[PDB]
Amino acid sequence: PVIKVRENEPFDVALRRFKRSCEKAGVLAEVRRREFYEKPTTERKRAKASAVKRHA
């Protein structure tokens, strides 16, 4: 995620763009995912349960 601030761009608009960019890139989620190991059985269990709840 990179932001170039345009001429006469307000700084807080640049902050808004930076926040939305890094959120859309998923960087923070990817960092939080990797701080602890997860057994493959646990990964598959969470995936399965998420899919199971994706029903109307």
Partner RNA sequence: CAAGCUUGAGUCUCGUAGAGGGGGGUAGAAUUCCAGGUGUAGCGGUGAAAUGCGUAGAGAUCUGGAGGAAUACCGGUGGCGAAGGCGGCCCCCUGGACGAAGACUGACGCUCAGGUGCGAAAGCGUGGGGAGCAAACAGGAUUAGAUACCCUGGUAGUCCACGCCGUAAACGAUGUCGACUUGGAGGUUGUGCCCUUGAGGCGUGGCUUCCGGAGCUAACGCGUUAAGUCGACCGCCUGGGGA
Partner RNA sequence: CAGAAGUGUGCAGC
Residues that bind RNA in the complex, under the rule CB under 7 A = 30, 37, 47-48, 50-52, 54-55
Indicate the residue among 15 and 27 with the shorter CB distance to RNA.
Answer: 27
**Separation in Å, CA 39 to CA 22, 43, 51:** 28, 7, 19
Angle at the Cα of 25 from the Cα atoms of 24 and 28, rounded to 5 degrees: 100
Residue 47's binding partner among other proteins, RNA, none (Cβ under 5 to 8 angstroms by kind) is RNA
Distance CA 23, CA 33 (A): 15
Positions that interact with other proteins (CB under 8 A): 1-2, 25
Least distance from C-beta 21 to other proteins, angstroms? 9
